Structure formats: structure tokens, C-alpha cells
């Protein structure tokens, strides 16, 4: 377990992209064993270790295991990503090199957060208050006592309340609602197709509405066919809002509901 729900290391950048992490490693000299930590953009509660070696960047996913420990795939578990980084500063233990030099956040640069991370604590507070009828200290104690389970639940449901999620509406309703108003390129929504985690991404491109399939594979991972895999729709939306990555264009303005 981390000491707090949020990471606070001086070399943690929050939810920067692979590309932003690489830009920071170049800014820091791309010296062998230069590294930073970012929040995983496709593994819930996960991190990514971005380290320079051979004037190349190497990126490792650090998963949160079921017991609240952290591990790169097939590696020893660690209490926290802080412990993982300090350990890999002493033993390579499978990494391309020893971690030698943390690249720290430049002065006054804060860890990046997404829409979900900015809503998360308040969504959990509202859920415990309304489910259990609690106030003040009692509310605060209840949040803390089940923090890990509450974080998993709010993550799985938070999309329902977000502006781009229109629930169970038809293909036809989606084309109609996307084509209302300014035909801003990248205007988008996500709709449900069934109750079994199948969805569609509806995207405005040169006055035409495209539909991409979003499917839950047998692991519980959401993806567009041949696309990056995510634990949540809010992760998927954050990714395709940064770069097209196979879409005809990047997602921009969420289509307003009615």
C-alpha cells in the first residue's frame, strides 16, 4: 500500500503520456539510468516506470496486485512504487539497467490529473454519505476504513455521470444528437449497446458521424479492435483525447446531453 491514495514522490508526474515522459527524459539529458514515474493511463491503480538507457526510452507497467502491493509483470512485489524505485536503484533484477538519477518535476510543475482523478474523492464521499447516511468524522472514518474497495467501485461507475456518456441510446439517436449544433471536428459521445460492457464511440469527422465498436475482452479490458486496452471508459476517453492512435481524428468536445 502507498502511504496516501495519491503518489507524492518528487519524480512522479501523474498522468503524463509516454511522449511527455520521453520529452522530460530528453530535457533531463537522456543519461543512462535517468528515470521518472507516471500514473498508468490504461491499468487502474497502476504506474509506469520510464527510464533512459542507450539513448532510448524503456517503459514498464507497474500493476497494483489484488493485495495492494505493486509489481512489474513477473517481478517481486513491493509495498509502494517508492520501494520499487529504491530497490531497482540497488539491483537491476530484470530492468534494462540500474536506476541512477531521478528526473524531478521542474519547480512549480505539479503531477498531472485527469477528469476522473479530479472527481474521484468527491464521488466516493457522495456515495458513502448517501448509502450509509453519515456526516462529519463518521463519514471520514467510513471512507478510510473501506478506501480501497470504494476506489474500485467509483472507478467502475464514474463514467455514467461524465458528460460524454449518453447511456443506452440507439445508433440513430446518437447520429441525431451529435449533428445538432456546431459541427466541431472531434465532437464525440460513448453509448452502451447491451448491459454486458459492449459500447460504441461516436465521433464527428468533416460533418459525418463515425461509430467505433468498444468491447470487453475475457480479462475485463475495454478496447476498439486492434486498439490499446483499458480497465475503464474514462481511461479510453483520456487516451483518444490526446492522440487519434488509429481513429480518423482526436476526440475534442464531449457532445452535451438533452
Amino acid at each position: 500500500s502507498m502511504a496516501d491514495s495519491a503518489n507524492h514522490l518528487p519524480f512522479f508526474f501523474g498522468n503524463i503520456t509516454r511522449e511527455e515522459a520521453e520529452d522530460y527524459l530528453v530535457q533531463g539529458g537522456m543519461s543512462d539510468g535517468l528515470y521518472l514515474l507516471r500514473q498508468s493511463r490504461n491499468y487502474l491503480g497502476g504506474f509506469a516506470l520510464s527510464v533512459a538507457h542507450g539513448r532510448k526510452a524503456h517503459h514498464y507497467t507497474i500493476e497494483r496486485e489484488l493485495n495492494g502491493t505493486y509489481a512489474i509483470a513477473g517481478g517481486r512485489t513491493h509495498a509502494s512504487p517508492a520501494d520499487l524505485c529504491h530497490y531497482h536503484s540497488q539491483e537491476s533484477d530484470g530492468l534494462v539497467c540500474l536506476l541512477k538519477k531521478p528526473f524531478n518535476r521542474p519547480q512549480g510543475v505539479q503531477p498531472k490529473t485527469g477528469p476522473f482523478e479530479d472527481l474521484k474523492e468527491n464521488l466516493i464521499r457522495e456515495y458513502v454519505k448517501q448509502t450509509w447516511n453519515l456526516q462529519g468524522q463518521a463519514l471520514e472514518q467510513a471512507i478510510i476504513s473501506q478506501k480501497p474497495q470504494l476506489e474500485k467501485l467509483i472507478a467502475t461507475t464514474a463514467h455514467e455521470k461524465m458528460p460524454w456518456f449518453h447511456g443506452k441510446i440507439s445508433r440513430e439517436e446518437s447520429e441525431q444528437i451529435v449533428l445538432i449544433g456546431s459541427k466541431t471536428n472531434g465532437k464525440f459521445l460513448i453509448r452502451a449497446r447491451d448491459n454486458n460492457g459492449s459500447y460504441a464511440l461516436c465521433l464527428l469527422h468533416e460533418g459525418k458521424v463515425l461509430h467505433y465498436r468498444i468491447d470487453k475482452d475475457k480479462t475485463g479490458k475495454l478496447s476498439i479492435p486492434e486498439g490499446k486496452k483499458f480497465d475503464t471508459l474514462w481511461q479510453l476517453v483520456e487516451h483518444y483525447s490526446y492522440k487519434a492512435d488509429g481513429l480518423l481524428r482526436v476526440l475534442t468536445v464531449p457532445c452535451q446531453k438533452i
Binding site: H58, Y60, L203, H211, E226, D245, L247, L248
Partner: peptide
């Protein structure tokens, strides 16, 4: 075609523990 296919997804290689 009714659902758009993805075009050429960018290279996005994750490193693994090795040696």
C-alpha cells in the same frame, strides 16, 4: 462499412523484465 476500423495504431512497445 457500418463501424469504422482503426487505421495504423502508433508503435507503443512496453518493456519486460529480462536477463
Amino acid at each position: 462499412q457500418l463501424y469504422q476500423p482503426l487505421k495504423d495504431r502508433e508503435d507503443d512497445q512496453y518493456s519486460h523484465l529480462q536477463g
